[model samples]
Target: SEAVKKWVNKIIEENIIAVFAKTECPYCIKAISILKGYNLNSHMHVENIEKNPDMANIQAYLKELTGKSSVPRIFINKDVVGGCDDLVKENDEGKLKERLQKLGLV
Candidate 1:
């Protein structure tokens, strides 16, 4: 548990943009495509949950950190940007770009 938390914290602190996702998840795919559109792919760190042996622990730690256990858990500048639907909403409202621009990621 502590290890998982530490791992997640290190990941969040190390990358300005990070996503915890399952490789086969449709929402994850959608979110990744959106990130790719901004040319922000290089800055994004994606963790494929299905590939991790500690998946359940990782998910539990994520829920502790962001209050959600769902994949496509996105972080920007170490802040929770929410899940896929949240990202799409922000993109639709034009706020996602604004946030990215403010972070100088776009």
Candidate 2:
């Protein structure tokens, strides 16, 4: 439990843009594509569920930390930005770009 928490915290702390996702998830794919469009793909740290054996525990920790249990749990500057649907909504509304620019990510 502590290890999972530590690892999750380390990931959020070290990455400006972090996404806890699943490789086979359509929403994760869309979220990745959206970030890639901004040329921010390189800076995005995506933790794939298929690749991590501890993914379930990690996700549980995420739920405790973010109050959400779904994939594409996106974070920017150590803050929860929301999941795939929220990300798409924000991007479509142009707020995502604005926020990225303000954070100097663009």
Candidate 3:
């Protein structure tokens, strides 16, 4: 847990939008693409989980960090904004951009 948290925390510390995603994954692709549509800036960080050596341990850490051991962990600042479908929901509701704007990134 310490090792995993160390790296994960370190990664998030450098960005406002931290997407812990996975390569070749549809949901991860969708979530990241959506985020890119808004602002594809350096502050937006995407680290593919599949690229990591410890897959299960990384996912296991996610389960405790959020609520599920899922890909496309979309974190806005310090809070996670759910996954692709949830982002879609926020977008449809017209709150996505507003939410991001308020964060000074939209």
Candidate 4:
């Protein structure tokens, strides 16, 4: 749906943070868990892109913005924070906290 595209685009472009992933994916769940640990109610946008061919375009747009096609692509302050591994690593190393503080979340 074009409306869905517009809604997604506006969120991706205007929201300070976002997550794109499939429901029930381990990696996606991990990503959300980590964000929740940080006390961030990260805006989540989920869709079965594989089943919905039209979602291919959104996937491409996300990849162009994140440089990876991995599920659970996370963006913080409009910057790609990567997938589960990257996000976990950053969280463990305090980078995620620092970034969040900079955004006044801390």
- Per-residue alpha-carbon lDDT of candidate 3 for residues 1-106, written as tens digits (9 for 90 to 100): 6898888887777788888888789988888888888875667888888888987888888778888889888777767687888889998998888888897776
* Candidate 1 runs further than 4 Å off: none
After superposition, which runs of candidate 3 have C-alpha atoms over 4 Å from their true positions? none
Q: Cα deviation of 36 in candidate 2 (Å)?
A: 1.0
Q: How close is candidate 1 to the true structure, as a TM-score?
A: 0.94
Writing each residue's lDDT as its tens digit, candidate 4 over 9-78 gives 7766776667778757898888887787777774444444455555667776777777887677888877
Better of 2 and 4 by TM-score: 2
What's the residue-level lDDT of 8 in candidate 1? 87
Q: Which stretches of candidate 2 lie over 4 Å from their true place?
A: none
The residue pairs that clash in candidate 3, if any, are: none
RMSD values, in order shown? 1.0, 1.2, 1.3, 2.9
Angstrom error of the Cα, residue 51, model 1: value is 1.0
Residue pairs whose backbone atoms clash in candidate 4:
none
**TM-score of each model, paired residue for residue:** 0.94, 0.91, 0.90, 0.79
Order the candidates by TM-score, highest first — what do you get?
Answer: 1, 2, 3, 4
List model 2 lDDT by residue over 31-100, tens digit each: 9888888888767898886588898898888888788878989988887888988998999999889889
In each prediction, how many residue pairs overlap at the backbone (N, C-alpha, C within less than 3 A)?
0, 0, 0, 0
